[PDB]
Design an enzyme around this catalytic site. Sequence first.
Site: not given
Ligand SMILES: [Mg+2]
Length: 248
Positions: A124, A205
């Site tokens: 990410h 998150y």
């Molecule tokens: Mg992921």
Amino acid sequence: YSDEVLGATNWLKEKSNQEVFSFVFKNENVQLNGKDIGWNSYKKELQEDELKSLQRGAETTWDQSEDMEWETTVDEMTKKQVFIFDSLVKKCLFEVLNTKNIFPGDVNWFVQHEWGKDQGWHCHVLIGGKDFSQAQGKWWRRQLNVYWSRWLVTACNVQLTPAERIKLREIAEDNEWVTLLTYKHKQTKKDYTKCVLFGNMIAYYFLTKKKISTSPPRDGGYFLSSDSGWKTNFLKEGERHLVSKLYT
Ligand SMILES: [Mg+2]
């Protein structure tokens, strides 16, 4: 709380509402003329100075964020490949920043390597700043995929013919081995870039994930993270959860 935990929390909270792009860098398994190119078939260490420096950064980030109270049994090959990918991902980002004449200090970014239940390794990237606007998202994804496919073919450790290298290069592009977050949509319809909120996404998150400590990796776990402020890099899993707690 440690200055490191306090410092990371404050840095993220200052950026709680900064709009940023969300990308995922990945690869997919490929078989070319009987030759198997898996997720970890990219283990050439390329002797480019910047790349070497970036890989050293990944190594030391891993080393400093390692919790030694318990034991870690992640495969050596896995760690090596993740360190290499960290350098390659960042090389791609920096190459596109250069294209746009963006001073690296004017950019907020966050990188997190993970292991998905289905897809396995992926990375990410959140990235944005004053020189970034939503309409540029599609262009950014395309440029990033150009450099990513280019670097992967250079780093591939499988002996390939020129024809096979070119095939691999076009697979990585056609199959979008860099993805961009968009709003949900129908296939034939338009897609709109979906910016996310930098600090909130990290605290609520990415910092909630469980640390990978074994091979095979725990599904959904993270390997390694870093950011443009070197704030989360060296944090152990326990410290990352403390950051989330303080951020709230
Ligand atoms: Mg992921």
